[PDB]
Amino acid sequence: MIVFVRFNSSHGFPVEVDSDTSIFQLKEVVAKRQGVPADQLRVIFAGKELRNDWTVQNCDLDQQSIVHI
Amino acid sequence: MQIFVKTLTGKTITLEVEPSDTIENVKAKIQDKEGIPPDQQRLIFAGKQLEDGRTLSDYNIQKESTLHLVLRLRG
Amino acid sequence: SFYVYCKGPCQRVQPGKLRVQCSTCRQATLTLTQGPSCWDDVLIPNRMSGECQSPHCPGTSAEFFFKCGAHPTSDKETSVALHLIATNSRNITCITCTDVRSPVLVFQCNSRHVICLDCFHLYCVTRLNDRQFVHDPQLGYSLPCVAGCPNSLIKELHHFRILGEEQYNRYQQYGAEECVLQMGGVLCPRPGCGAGLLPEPDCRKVTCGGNGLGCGFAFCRECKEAYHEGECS
Ligand SMILES: [Zn+2]
Ligand SMILES: [Zn+2]
Ligand SMILES: [Zn+2]
Ligand SMILES: [Zn+2]
Ligand SMILES: [Zn+2]
Ligand SMILES: [Zn+2]
């Protein structure tokens, strides 16, 4: 499935993930695109910060919803 | 966003607004377009008179929705 | 589940999603201190709080918004919440047709009466055309509980979106007309006009054409014919 990321209010970019995909995995893949440390990144969805250990399934992220990394 | 203001005759004016624009703010832009003094303007949505202090968001007025305009006459 | 009116592409009542942005920078970067417990928490502005995690913004106040859940939607593709509408999980029968359907609308009368959307559509299309909607200077053009329960006027008038587009626009037209009349105003009697006018109550002479908004007709508000001196007829 796809999740849209708004890195520091930048235009949303699609990221392909799985149900089993963790938040840190997404933090890594975004960190690579932006060439920054994944440790400085925080993922915000539905007025909550998503923790690294949580998966996409656990977060109840719907197809093509948006997070604010 | 785009909203519409219509008189009861059906005459239609288009405005570029934000949900945060006050009812007072909406009343202005109308003066810019049609030259109606704001004091003569009364705006209505779903049969409710809109109060100057309030915003479009206060009335949950959506993009492409219509406000109705009627005129106060001093005579 | 919550329900919204999606104006496009669904053009119908759909299940919705609740989301939240910072009230100052209008970005979904605000983390809530606590989750909402009631409708008022999400409906009344600035009611709940948190921290906008965008550094340049000292965001405090939370702004809740709603989206259609039937398809992908952008951050700013918002829909109006129809807070009276609920999933009929407990299979409550419609107060009008007695059948079980989902979703349903729940009136805010003491008895919290339940109506299906087909019957609500019906209730609405019947009352509008018969000029049986009620004007409340506080609420607007609305309808009460179909059972006639007191203090049951619908407060969120976007619920009348169930009328459908054309009938909705007629509803708004009729409501504005009624607003004028309840304020002691007059509708211009000239054919093709019908402009809403609010003269001073003392004035008998009402002139409708300065900025192009009027037809210029000067009329007597009592007989609705061209302005005349003395008594009508
Ligand atoms: Zn939709
Ligand atoms: Zn902010
Ligand atoms: Zn029914
Ligand atoms: Zn009732
Ligand atoms: Zn006229
Ligand atoms: Zn007369």
Residue numbers in the entry:
A (entry chain C): 1 to 69
B (entry chain B): 1 to 75
C (entry chain A): 145 to 352, 354 to 378
Task: Provide excerpts from the study.
Parkin is an autoinhibited RBR family E3 ubiquitin ligase consisting of an N-terminal ubiquitin-like (Ubl) domain followed by four Zn2+ binding domains RING0, RING1, in-between-RING (IBR), and RING2. Like other RBR-family E3 ligases, Parkin binds to an E2, and ubiquitin is transferred from E2 onto the catalytic C431 residue (on RING2) of Parkin before ubiquitination of lysines on target substrates.
Phospho-Parkin K211N (3C) formed a stable complex with untethered R0RBR Q347C (TEV), and RING2 (383-465) was removed from R0RBR Q347C (TEV). The fractions containing the complex of phospho-Parkin K211N and R0RB (141-382) upon treatment with 3C protease followed by incubation with pUb-3Br showed co-elution of components of the ternary trans-complex (R0RB (141-382), pUbl-linker (1-140), and pUb) on SEC. The crystal structure of the ternary trans-complex of phospho-Parkin (pUbl-linker (1-140)+R0RB (141-382)+pUb) was solved at 1.92 Å, which further confirmed trans-complex formation between Parkin molecules. In the crystal structure, the pUbl domain from the donor molecule (phospho-Parkin K211N (3C)) was bound to the basic patch of RING0 on the acceptor molecule (untethered R0RBR (TEV)) in trans. The conformation observed in the trans-complex was similar to the phospho-Parkin (1-382) structure with fused pUbl domain and untethered/truncated RING2 in a cis molecule. The ternary trans-complex of phospho-Parkin (1–140+141-382 + pUb) structure in this study was solved at a similar resolution and in the same space group as the previously solved structure of phospho-Parkin (1-382) in complex with pUb.
